[PDB]
Amino acid sequence: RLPDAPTLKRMTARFAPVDVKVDVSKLPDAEKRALAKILQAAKIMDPLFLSQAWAGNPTLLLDLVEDTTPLGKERLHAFLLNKGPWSRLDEAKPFIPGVPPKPDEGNFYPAGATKAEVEAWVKSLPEAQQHAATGFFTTVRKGPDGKFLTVPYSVEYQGELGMAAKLLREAAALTQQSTLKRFLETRAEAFLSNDYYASEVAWMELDASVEPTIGPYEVYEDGWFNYKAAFEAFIGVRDEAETQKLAKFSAELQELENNLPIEPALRNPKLGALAPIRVINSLYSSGDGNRGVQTAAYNLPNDERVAAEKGTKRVMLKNIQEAKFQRVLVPIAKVALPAKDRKDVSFDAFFTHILMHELMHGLGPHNVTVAGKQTTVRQALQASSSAIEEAKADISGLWALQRLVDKGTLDKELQRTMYTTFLASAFRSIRFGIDEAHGKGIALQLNHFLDTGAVKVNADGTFEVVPDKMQASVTSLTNQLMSLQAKGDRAAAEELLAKQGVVRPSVQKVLEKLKNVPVDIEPRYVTAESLVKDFGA
Amino acid sequence: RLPDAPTLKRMTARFAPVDVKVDVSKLPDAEKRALAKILQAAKIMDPLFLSQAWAGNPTLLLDLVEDTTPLGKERLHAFLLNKGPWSRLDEAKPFIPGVPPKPDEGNFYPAGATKAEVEAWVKSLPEAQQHAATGFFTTVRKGPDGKFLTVPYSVEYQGELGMAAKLLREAAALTQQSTLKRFLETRAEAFLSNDYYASEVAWMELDASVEPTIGPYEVYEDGWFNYKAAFEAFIGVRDEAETQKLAKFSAELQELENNLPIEPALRNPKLGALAPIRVINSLYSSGDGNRGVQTAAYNLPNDERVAAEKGTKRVMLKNIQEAKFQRVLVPIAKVALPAKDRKDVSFDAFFTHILMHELMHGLGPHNVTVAGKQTTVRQALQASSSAIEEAKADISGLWALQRLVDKGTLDKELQRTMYTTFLASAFRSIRFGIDEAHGKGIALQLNHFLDTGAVKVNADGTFEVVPDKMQASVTSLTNQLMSLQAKGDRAAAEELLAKQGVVRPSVQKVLEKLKNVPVDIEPRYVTAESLVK
Ligand SMILES: [Zn+2]
Ligand SMILES: [Zn+2]
């Protein structure tokens, strides 16, 4: 059951340590001082997320810290890396004695509750109370009279969020960048109002050298319903050259939406008008932004009301992606692919596809009407929504990448590298774990490719793309996933993930030859540490 | 201006490390097993209290766990000992860089709020709702509609309290001590219902080898109002024989109340009926029960309704008292007192006075009516209540000790040792610091003694009791403090604390000569850690 110090050191070493140094010599003094305050606010996301993941985390940490044995130090490292006593890579197997199984409910729901109890209470509420109860930024608690009630995040986490708000406000007073001041002010305010709409708009309107993402966003930690958002931060320095090169993609979105291989009625004829894309070098992440496998890029807001009315912002973490490529993808390709396809794995393809993935998160069905009630694909699919959506983004990303190479917007060299790089990366992602949204979604795609003849298994164990079947296979899964989403068909989604969201034995064979290769990275944010020491008061 | 590693290590060393070992060999197996589960629940009060004291604590703790230089390690130890970045012995001076001055409000009140703002909001509520807002077991937060609201503790700390409730319910199933089962079950329920009355009664009715005190109790950490309770635990093993020696005191309570040296109308004509007294050897403490200076004993509940209707329970932590007396009081007595008076220091006098102190917390004014409004002494005096109530308990404890010696209930030997032992302890408590309730209250007493000539300073700078002036001095201060509480006179309380709650030059000179003596103790709960593995 429980690993010894060497077994645990080894498990933790699957996250290759990387010192994440980011050049900040180009920033004026004032912007470094603002950045230090921002960093200080960001740090607060770490204990916030820790206690979202599990209410017993703070208590355990105090136990872990007293044990300065070598085993104890490995346990503390593992705990901090995984934000809890469960191995995120190994289907949440505990590595600390005396802990229970990882609760799907995290610390978002009533003490003692079951999923069934929560659902039954929600369904007894009037419409408006249901939407409040099932929203991103409320917890659910048992009140003194024993009945369930909704608590706004601004109230749940007030102490911590007040301190974060104060630091963002101090940052806002130091920066000379107007769009950053505005974001910082409005996000400080949102923390305490619980209304994120204005501050998300300000966030999308950012055009500054410092690109802070901070607040409650992703729902992967709510394993019951995928309703409740987790606190996170990513704080980066804008890479202007790379950002400018991508601006042209925003203009391609409405056309892609207009041509989605689904029933025409299901298409969005008017996407939100904001589609900023920013390339940044990240110099800090926290909360849900620093646990297990590192985030490479993202598309926010997730909140469909803001996204429908305004659009969404895609962020690429270039330096993180270069580390993943270098330290994981290239070594994987050497084992997973036949010798002749290894030259067709390129960072340009990897990067580009990640971009297409974030672009396509913002396209396809989101707000939908199911059985006479207006809802959202996410709300309809509940705990199945995350895996399905990641699959959709990945597969429709390829669909869109092909379209944009065809029209000349993307380089023709991507015709040679796009699918083979994706195939190597399928092995990369599936090693995140079959219960992890990206991992599960990639297993479903890869199985789809095998079942349609778009990838094949060779006799040396390696896998390879079969080009003449790839494009139609990509298009079919795009159609399947989006149509299931549009229907709000939770039962179909569950069945598909149960049947196809698995590691087939040919894939497991490759995974056994990759035990010597890291699964992802462990950032040490050396520049962020020094900024806060040098500029922080 | 912050301390370096060796300086901070020396600071922390003023809490003398004590291995706290408790003999559990006479507990049956099932009771040891329930004790473990109880100890698991108790551990939860540590992070609960950390978060109550400062919203910045969990974030700071993660920074400190990562600095493993020798400075880092001393910073972590001091952080855990003081339950925050502020030195509880040095007027809350920070010992961590980048930390603000300790917030009086802790993490009980709304983000960005001032004390004046909370006062105005409360005053603006319907009388019905003011009680909820100024009660022990709600936090106050700004809601999204902009306005302040009340959050029950059972909602505010839900996750952690659910885990604590689960563990107490597990303990209840293991133990075969019926009354312990009842307490553990009702307390588990209380954590989630936020109504502690029934479980307090069950806690007072306990008759078991294991004495678990666990829940939200003392208000010292609310430096604005003294409204809000902090989570704590004290887990111990009953000393049967010592407990039986004290059973007789319960019967003395109403009689003591009946004779308090105040306007007779102010006396309570009928105390709550319950007055259990327990002597226990503590084997674990947490939350507000393990920060800085250790608690020696206590009187709970603080909830004046339960107390008035049902009574209160007094618990003496004998092993902790023994360590304080040996390691601290005794060495102080050899400096602070003239050589002739030193033989009149005794553990019996020290122990006895602490008991009187705990008895007298439960007597005197509590529920009072101030300007047409039913209230409590505590809520009327706000941030001044704690130091006034501690001075009351100490000085009225001497008044009661003297009365019980005069009656024959306590032995005459205490006539020789009670005042002189208390004088040495006064130097003990004032070293906790002038901003700490016990220390400020003891300053107020020692200075009253100086002013009435009940204690004098000798030419060699030592202090000594003047016996023929002491009894009357104790009585007038008892009268002063109780009358002040009865009137709910917060202005007078503030004025008395500011004027008399200070370390005078003669005392400071003694304190200088005490630089080598520990201030208190740091428990290492060796038996508790064994039970939980
Ligand atoms: Zn995605
Ligand atoms: Zn007291």
What does this structure look like?
2 copies of one chain form a homodimer. By secondary structure, chain A is of the alpha+beta class. In chain A, 52% of the residues lie in helices and 14% in strands. Chain A contains 24 helices and 15 strands. The first copy, chain A, has helices at 5-12, 29-43, 45-53, 57-66, 70-82, 115-123, 127-133, 153-156, 158-174, 178-193, 197-204, 240-246, 253-258, 304-310, 318-336, 347-361, 377-381, 385-406, 414-430, 437-451, 467-487, 490-500, 505-512, 526-535, and strands spanning 15-19, 86-87, 93-94, 138-142, 148-152, 210-218, 230-238, 277-287, 297-300, 313-317, 367-370, 373-376, 455-457, 463-465, 520-524. In chain A, the strands form 6 sheets. In chain A, strands 6-7-8-10-9 form a 5-stranded mixed β-sheet. In chain A, a hairpin with a 2-residue loop joins strand 11 and strand 12 (373-376). In chain A, helix 18 (385-406) runs antiparallel to helix 19 (414-430). The termini of chain A are far apart. One zinc ion binds at residues 357, 361, 390, 393 of chain B.
Fold blueprint:
The structure is a homodimer.
Chain A: H1 5-12, E1 15-19, H2 29-43, H3 45-53, H4 57-66, H5 70-82, E2 86-87, E3 93-94, H6 115-123, H7 127-133, E4 138-142, E5 148-152, H8 153-156, H9 158-174, H10 178-193, H11 197-204, E6 210-218, E7 230-238, H12 240-246, H13 253-258, E8 277-287, E9 297-300, H14 304-310, E10 313-317, H15 318-336, H16 347-361, E11 367-370, E12 373-376, H17 377-381, H18 385-406, H19 414-430, H20 437-451, E13 455-457, E14 463-465, H21 467-487, H22 490-500, H23 505-512, E15 520-524, H24 526-535
Helix pairs in contact in A: 1-5, 2-9, 2-24, 4-5, 9-10, 10-11, 15-19, 16-18, 16-19, 18-19, 18-20, 18-21, 19-20
